Amino acid sequence: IKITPEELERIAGNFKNAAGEAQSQINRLEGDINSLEGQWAGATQAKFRGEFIQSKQAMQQYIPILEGISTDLKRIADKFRN
Amino acid sequence: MAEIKITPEELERIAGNFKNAAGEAQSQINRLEGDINSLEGQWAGATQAKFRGEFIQSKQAMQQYIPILEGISTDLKRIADKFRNTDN
Numbered sequence: 226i227k228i229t230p231e232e233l234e235r236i237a238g239n240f241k242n243a244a245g246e247a248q249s250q251i252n253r254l255e256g257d258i259n260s261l262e263g264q265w266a267g268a269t270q271a272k273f274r275g276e277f278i279q280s281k282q283a284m285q286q287y288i289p290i291l292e293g294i295s296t297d298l299k300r301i302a303d304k305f306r307n
Numbered sequence: 308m309a310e311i312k313i314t315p316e317e318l319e320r321i322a323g324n325f326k327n328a329a330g331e332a333q334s335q336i337n338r339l340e341g342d343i344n345s346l347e348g349q350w351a352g353a354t355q356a357k358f359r360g361e362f363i364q365s366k367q368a369m370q371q372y373i374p375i376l377e378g379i380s381t382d383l384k385r386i387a388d389k390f391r392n393t394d395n
Contacts, residue, residue, distance in 0.1 A: 226349070226350050226351075227348070227349040227350065228346065228349040228350055236342045236345075236346070239338070239339065239342055240339065240342075243335050243338075243339055246331075246335065247332070247335070250328050250331065250332070253324070253328075254324065254325065254328055254376075257321045257324055257325075260311065260321075261313065261321070263310070264310065264311075264312060264313045265313055269386075272382075273379065273382070273383075276375060276378060276379050276382070277379065279375050280372055280375040280376055280379070283368050283369075283371045283372035283375065284368070284372060286364075286368040287365055287368040287369060287372065290361060290364050290365040290368065291339075291365055293361065294358065294361050294362065294365070297357075297358070297361070298358075301354075
């Protein structure tokens with residue numbers, strides 16, 4: 226083993242932070258989609274809401290994977306240190 | 308304050324937000340892959356394989372997400388164009 230617990234924790238932080246940024250991104254984009262509601266036809270809005278929900282579903286897979294990686298790294302760092 | 312009315316400029320602004328988001332997402336997955344790569348050889352191969360496998364799962368989700376954002380951007384731009392060409 227060449228890696229230090231501190232380095233594993235740094236990379237774990239990168240994964241946690243990426244997961245947070247991804248959630249923030251989709252939140253901002255959701256605001257944009259929300260802003261269009263009622264400003265054009267319901268059928269048009271429904272199409273964009275549908276597409277946007279597909280993007281949310283992808284992110285609902287992505288985020289827990291990143292958090293899992295982050296936590297797995299921290300678990301190993303703890304094991305190495307102690 | 309009033310609700311902001313849709314115009315081609317508004318649709319293009321939002322289309323740009325989606326396109327920018329796709330690029331930021333690409334940058335993120337590239338950075339994280341670099342992190343996973345940086346661990347190669349720093350510990351047992353079996354451990355590296357586990358993290359590579361999990362990372363590949365995240366990359367696959369990301370490879371669905373990015374084109375969906377790009378599709379939204381394209382669709383918004385298409386409507387912006389239609390608005391511009393039917394008004395002027």
